[PDB]
Amino acid sequence: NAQAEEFKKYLETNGIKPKQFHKKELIFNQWDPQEYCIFLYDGITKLTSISENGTIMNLQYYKGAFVIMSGFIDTETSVGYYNLEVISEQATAYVIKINELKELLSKNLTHFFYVFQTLQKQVSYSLAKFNDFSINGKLGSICGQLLILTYVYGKETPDGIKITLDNLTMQELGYSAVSRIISKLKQEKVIVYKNSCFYVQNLDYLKRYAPKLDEWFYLACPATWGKLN
Amino acid sequence: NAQAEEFKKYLETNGIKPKQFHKKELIFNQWDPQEYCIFLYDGITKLTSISENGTIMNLQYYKGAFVIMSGFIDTETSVGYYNLEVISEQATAYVIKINELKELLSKNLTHFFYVFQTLQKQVSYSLAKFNDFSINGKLGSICGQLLILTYVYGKETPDGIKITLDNLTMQELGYSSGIAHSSAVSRIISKLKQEKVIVYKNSCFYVQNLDYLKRYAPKLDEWFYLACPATWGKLN
Ligand SMILES: Cc1ccc(Cc2cc(=O)n3c(c2C2CC2)SC[C@H]3C(=O)O)c2ccccc12
Ligand SMILES: Cc1ccc(Cc2cc(=O)n3c(c2C2CC2)SC[C@H]3C(=O)O)c2ccccc12
Ligand code: NA
Numbered sequence: 280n281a282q283a284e285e286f287k288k289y290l291e292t293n294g295i296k297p298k299q300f301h302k303k304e305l306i307f308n309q310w311d312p313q314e315y316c317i318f319l320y321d322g323i324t325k326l327t328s329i330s331e332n333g334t335i336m337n338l339q340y341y342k343g344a345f346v347i348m349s350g351f352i353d354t355e356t357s358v359g360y361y362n363l364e365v366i367s368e369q370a371t372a373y374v375i376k377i378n379e380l381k382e383l384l385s386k387n388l389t390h391f392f393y394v395f396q397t398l399q400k401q402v403s404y405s406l407a408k409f410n411d412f413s414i415n416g417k418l419g420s421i422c423g424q425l426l427i428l429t430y431v432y433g434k435e436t437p438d439g440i441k442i443t444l445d446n447l448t449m450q451e452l453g454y455s456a457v458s459r460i461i462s463k464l465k466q467e468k469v470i471v472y473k474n475s476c477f478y479v480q481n482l483d484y485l486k487r488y489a490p491k492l493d494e495w496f497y498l499a500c501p502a503t504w505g506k507l508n
Numbered sequence: 509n510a511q512a513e514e515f516k517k518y519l520e521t522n523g524i525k526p527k528q529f530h531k532k533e534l535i536f537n538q539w540d541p542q543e544y545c546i547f548l549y550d551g552i553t554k555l556t557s558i559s560e561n562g563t564i565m566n567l568q569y570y571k572g573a574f575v576i577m578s579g580f581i582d583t584e585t586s587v588g589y590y591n592l593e594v595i596s597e598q599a600t601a602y603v604i605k606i607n608e609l610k611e612l613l614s615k616n617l618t619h620f621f622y623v624f625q626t627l628q629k630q631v632s633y634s635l636a637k638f639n640d641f642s643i644n645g646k647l648g649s650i651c652g653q654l655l656i657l658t659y660v661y662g663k664e665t666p667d668g669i670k671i672t673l674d675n676l677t678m679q680e681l682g683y684s685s686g687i688a689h690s691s692a693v694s695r696i697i698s699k700l701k702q703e704k705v706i707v708y709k710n711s712c713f714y715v716q717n718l719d720y721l722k723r724y725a726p727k728l729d730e731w732f733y734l735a736c737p738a739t740w741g742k743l744n
């Protein structure tokens with residue numbers, strides 16, 4: 280995004296520098312009382328919650344460029360006990376204490392609005408995910424995840440649309456009730472495992488079962504959506 | 509709500525008058541090419557969608573005071589094909605075209621922050637609902653809906669925590685977001701009643717086992733504590 284590049288310049292102009300993280304690192308964590316604004320510039324992360332018995336809940340995936348805030352902009356207190364875990368091999372992020380951010384959002388309104396609109400994109404993402412699950416259950420969820428991966432990481436090859444992700448990252452994303460759905464899908468030549476990669480061969484099927492996420496992508500990321508429509 | 513009362517004052521200072529709506533009216537709709545910022549001041553609404561075959565989907569509930577924006581602040585285009593439907597008898601709202609909300613928030617960062625933090629509360633709300641559904645399924649979803657009803661509208665009495673909402677409105681709200689009046693949800697709710705988690709007495713409803721709701725909606729309970737600590741505190 281150009282809006283993302285301008286935000287990066289704005290931060291680096293104000294002496295906030297990028298930080299590199301490696302896979303499994305927590306950019307912020309649920310036990311930390313200091314809250315942050317993360318500008319995820321590059322890489323893939325997941326928002327988790329860890330219960331007292333140790334079970335890890337995967338709540339949300341984010342890719343750069345995006346903004347993730349662990350605290351409320353006004354109170355500076357936590358919005359939820361969450362970790363931001365790196366799942367790509369490396370990720371680059373700008374890490375801003377929440378108080379320090381208020382100063383900088385204020386001087387510039389273009390950049391205030393860039394962060395505002397990322398929140399709006401998150402809200403409508405969650406509602407669309409929910410709408411697709413209410414209609415089509417787990418098939419909807421899984422079709423939705425494959426759809427966004429196709430739009431974002433897909434590449435045209437003679438074998439279909441290849442999802443061009445490191446095979447290690449694919450494992451981090453989930454690639455017994457899920458086992459059976461992924462089975463039906465290749466069982467119907469919607470997806471295929473060739474060359475140890477992952478190819479989509481019936482993109483219309485994915486659009487059919489994740490209609491509201493498809494609409495979200497159209498409305499919120501139209502230039503990308505347009506590559507495959 | 510002090511921050512919201514100040515916002516209302518800021519809108520009237522810039523000449524924006526409130527509008528009144530009635531139950532079943534749409535404050536904004538999915539077909540309108542112009543997108544709006546709604547400052548819901550009083551009353552209860554729901555965000556709805558429609559699928560190809562005409563099925564109404566209830567996505568989200570909102571109560572005054574709150575902000576609901578139908579379009580992106582920068583591009584001014586739709587965030588999704590949604591309607592905002594009034595479900596209380598009446599509702600009062602301020603309706604601002606999206607391009608103007610931008611001037612208004614640029615002129616006063618106190619009010620910018622008020623709206624920004626409204627979005628932050630929505631984001632965290634949806635993640636907590638997701639988490640509770642992941643752990644406890646639809647029972648988690650229903651317990652959380654009743655938990656927030658209790659915190660927001662509940663008043664401690666000798667018979668338990670009375671839900672201070674007319675019986676009409678309050679049965680609709682017992683059904684979490686989804687398809688209206690489903691058999692599965694009606695059974696979950698009546699099971700909670702059979703087990704005396706929420707009970708009918710003298711024309712009113714009383715939550716008598718708040719701990720049970722907290723047990724099955726722990727992440728929405730934490731969300732309310734983090735987002736609305738003074739209201740959470742009153743009943744804990
Ligand atoms: C499988 C999958 C589904 C979902 C998202 C979320 C996403 C993706 C996305 O490309 N975008 C957004 C999100 C949601 C803000 C969160 S907001 C608009 C756009 C953007 O990034 O600018 C993924 C992100 C990373 C990796 C995998 C993901
Ligand atoms: C039963 C029930 C459960 C759930 C919500 C949602 C809610 C409620 C709520 O009280 N609040 C929020 C929400 C979700 C942002 C939307 S954000 C913080 C707080 C606030 O409004 O200030 C209700 C809203 C209206 C009526 C009933 C509701
Ligand atoms: Na934290």
Ligand code: NA
Nearest residue numbers: 537538540578
């Ligand atoms: Na609209």
